[PDB]
Assembly symmetry: D2
Homo-oligomer: 116 residues x 4
Amino acid sequence: CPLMVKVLDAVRGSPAINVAVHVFRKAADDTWEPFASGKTSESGELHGLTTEEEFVEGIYKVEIDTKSYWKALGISPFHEHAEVVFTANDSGPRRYTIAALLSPYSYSTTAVVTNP
Amino acid sequence: CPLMVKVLDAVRGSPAINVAVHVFRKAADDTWEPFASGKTSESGELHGLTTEEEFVEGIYKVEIDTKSYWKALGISPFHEHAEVVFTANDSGPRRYTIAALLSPYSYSTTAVVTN
Amino acid sequence: CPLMVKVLDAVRGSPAINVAVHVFRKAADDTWEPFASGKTSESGELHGLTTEEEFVEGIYKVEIDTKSYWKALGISPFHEHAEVVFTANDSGPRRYTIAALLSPYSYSTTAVVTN
Amino acid sequence: CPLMVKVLDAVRGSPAINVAVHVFRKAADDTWEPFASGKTSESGELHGLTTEEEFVEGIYKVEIDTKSYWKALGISPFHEHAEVVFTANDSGPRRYTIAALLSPYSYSTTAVVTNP
Ligand SMILES: Cc1ccc(C(=O)c2ccc(O)c([N+](=O)[O-])c2)cc1
Ligand SMILES: Cc1ccc(C(=O)c2ccc(O)c([N+](=O)[O-])c2)cc1
């Protein structure tokens, strides 16, 4: 599994469960093509977005639907979503974990990149 | 000044100077229309982006060109840019500060919204 | 003003107002000696803690009383306080801003050190 | 394992390996008594600090030796250490993960608390 997303909730001190995530890849025409999507599990993790064969070099956007997450909890947050945009696999295949820590008016995101 | 952007560097413990910032406003057809832009000052701040008259309710995107910032320092970074997408709402307080704290493989962002 | 402390609230998107802040300086016997204290202003800032004459090189601790802040808002928080421990060094730039961004179960802190 | 520590490096986009961690517990005389210590593994994680029986209610301080970590890499950082101070187990036993994301002039820390 070459792309994993993990989301934490800084208000509750818990995994952020049921967070929708949409991944896009920049196409040759420079538009954002839908690539994969899913939701975080009870551990805050989202596995199985893609395969090593399909996850080719390119520019990818991971959109974490933070507003939908906070609104489903009956909280009015600031951001629409958190967007994480990066070039992947340009030095050969890597494994990427995109992590995010959410509050209603703030978030932080980090990447852990490993070479299998 | 209804919108200010502040950028900080977590590697050097300093303002992030001469960072390009582009602001867009979501149009009726869901595209992003250029709205305002500039470069951060020696204090890491970008003032003067817009006016109260122009900054109507709607969805805005602030794009911070972090990749060029790190490369100018001779550092290889992870992200293409940092993006902050939010709704401006007239019910809340009137002044928006979008702050970003940058590292090569991470960033955080907060909003400080005051009267 | 060689040392300033700024505190922000990530739940409400605001300065963290009336937060108690205590600064200590490490003594020769490794204990923490009271050095300066105050409460953050309506802007989330605490100015005036010390003077250039008094702020000599050494190890300092800034303790931010986050638990009382959250409880006054009716929120149950994780940490007893936030602590920032650092060395003041005359070789580096002269002005230190210690910034903290607070959530109930998390906080971040950065240093912005400038001339 | 009721207390785990995870540390990430925001400059390299990797686990922070070989980070020393010292845990203290406030004693009846209000001093900080040494409680447990260890170092992060190649995954950035530190397991096995304590046991459910020994990890009683109290106020605990987790000291993450960030300066020692950056200096071992030949980097001059700002902070001496990151200190995480919290009351544990006051509503019965819980499992705590203390996470930290490190940069030379900044860090963020979060807690994930679960009820077994
Ligand atoms: C159990 C666990 C806890 C924390 C993390 C983590 O990666 C993490 C910790 C603090 C953070 O501010 C961010 N972030 O996204 O910026 C990520 C990962 C796993
Ligand atoms: C108006 C203003 C807003 C933010 C900051 C700032 O320094 C800041 C911004 C984002 C952060 O995650 C942190 N932090 O403590 O980790 C600090 C400084 C000034």
